Each structure stands twice: as structure tokens, then as C-alpha cells.
Scaffold this active site. Structure first.
Site, mmCIF file in Angstrom:
data_model
loop_
_atom_site.group_PDB
_atom_site.id
_atom_site.type_symbol
_atom_site.label_atom_id
_atom_site.label_comp_id
_atom_site.label_asym_id
_atom_site.label_seq_id
_atom_site.Cartn_x
_atom_site.Cartn_y
_atom_site.Cartn_z
ATOM 1 N N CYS A 1 3.553 3.619 -10.708
ATOM 2 C CA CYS A 1 2.472 2.991 -9.981
ATOM 3 C C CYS A 1 1.282 3.329 -10.882
ATOM 4 C CB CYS A 1 2.287 3.570 -8.579
ATOM 5 S SG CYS A 1 0.840 2.846 -7.731
ATOM 6 N N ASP B 1 0.824 -1.208 0.000
ATOM 7 C CA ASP B 1 0.000 0.000 0.000
ATOM 8 C C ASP B 1 0.865 1.267 0.000
ATOM 9 O OD1 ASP B 1 0.409 -0.024 3.140
ATOM 10 O OD2 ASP B 1 -0.785 1.785 2.752
#
Ligand SMILES: Cc1cc2cn(-c3cccc(C(=O)N/N=C/c4ccco4)c3)cc2cc1C
Length: 153
Positions: free
Chosen positions: A97, A65
């Protein structure tokens, strides 16, 4: 959002996250900047077989995360930088990402610091080129970050 960052003799490219259907355009964007390696810091997505076939190696080192990169990923990232720019001077390393989560930019930031920058300047240098560069947990990490392996003596 394709953003390029050059410091000393290091070059990085923070890209977006392509899908299988847009990989041909992605590969040519990478080549455009002479990118020879890509690091994915978020859960895998598109297939890498095609990218690799074009001469671009893909590295999958996801963070858990929005948490700071693990010690293992930071170590390998810094090692990659050191070896890639020494074995392929002038090349570019891409990292990504999804162009907005504030995760990928830390890696570039860490490279800048190890390269001699103050974390404060490293952050402003990146933040000026793109918004949403670092999530809260990310900034704090950089604040407390102490050089593990300097780039260039
Ligand atoms: C404040 C600030 C200052 C900056 C200075 N450069 C910059 C730009 C171009 C070249 C070099 C540089 O030293 N050459 N490396 C040489 C080298 C030799 C071996 C390895 O590397 C440094 C980017 C900056 C960005 C900011 C924000």
C-alpha cells in the site's frame, strides 16, 4: 520499507509504493528477492506496463479504505498463493500500500494463518519485523478469522 516474510515454503515481500520516476530501482529490488508477482491493495498509482515487461505481474485488488479485505479479495489472494507457490516453488509474492497504513500486512497474516499459524503468532511474527503492520479494524478481522482454504493439506 522492504520487509520479507518466509514461513513454510512461502515468501512474501511488503514493499513501499514507488512512483513512475523510481520504477527502475523498484523493479531491481523486486528481482533481488525473486518476486514474480505484486498485489496492490490501495488505489492504483505508478504505471504497471514497465513492471510487467520485466516479468513481474501486477494485481490490483484495493481494499475500501482501512476496512478488512472483501471476501472476493481474500478468496483470490489465497488462490494466488496456492497457485503461485505450486507453479513456481521458492518464488516471492510482493504486496503493498504505502509502507505504513496497516493494510497490506493483513494479506501476509492471512497466508500465515492458513499455513498453520495461530492469528496471535502470525501477528507477532509480522509486528516484530515492522511497526504499523495492522490497523485496528485489521487486527479484529484476524482475531475472528476462520480458515477458508488451508495452504498445504
Ligand atoms: C513460532 C514460529 C514457528 C515457525 C516455523 N517456521 C518455519 C521456518 C522454515 C520452515 C518451516 C516449515 O515448516 N517448512 N515448510 C515445509 C513445507 C513443506 C511443504 C510446504 O511447506 C517453518 C517459521 C516460524 C515462525 C514462527 C513465528
Amino acid at each position: 520499507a522492504p520487509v520479507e516474510v518466509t514461513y513454510k515454503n512461502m515468501r512474501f515481500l511488503i514493499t513501499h509504493n514507488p512512483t513512475n520516476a523510481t520504477l527502475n530501482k523498484f523493479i531491481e529490488e523486486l528481482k533481488k528477492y525473486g518476486v514474480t508477482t505484486i498485489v496492490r491493495v490501495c488505489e492504483a498509482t505508478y504505471d504497471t506496463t514497465l513492471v510487467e515487461k520485466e516479468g513481474i505481474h501486477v494485481l490490483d485488488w484495493p481494499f475500501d479504505d482501512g476496512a478488512p479485505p472483501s471476501n472476493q479479495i481474500v478468496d483470490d489472494w489465497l488462490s494466488l498463493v496456492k497457485i503461485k507457490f505450486r507453479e513456481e516453488p521458492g518464488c516471492c509474492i510482493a504486496v503493498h500500500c504505502v509502507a505504513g497504513l496497516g493494510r497490506a500486512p493483513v494479506l501476509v497474516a492471512l497466508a500465515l494463518i492458513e499455513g498453520g499459524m495461530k492469528y496471535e503468532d502470525a501477528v507477532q511474527f509480522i509486528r516484530q519485523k515492522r511497526r504499523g503492520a495492522f490497523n485496528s479494524k485489521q487486527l479484529l478481522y484476524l482475531e475472528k478469522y476462520r480458515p477458508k482454504m488451508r495452504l498445504r493439506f
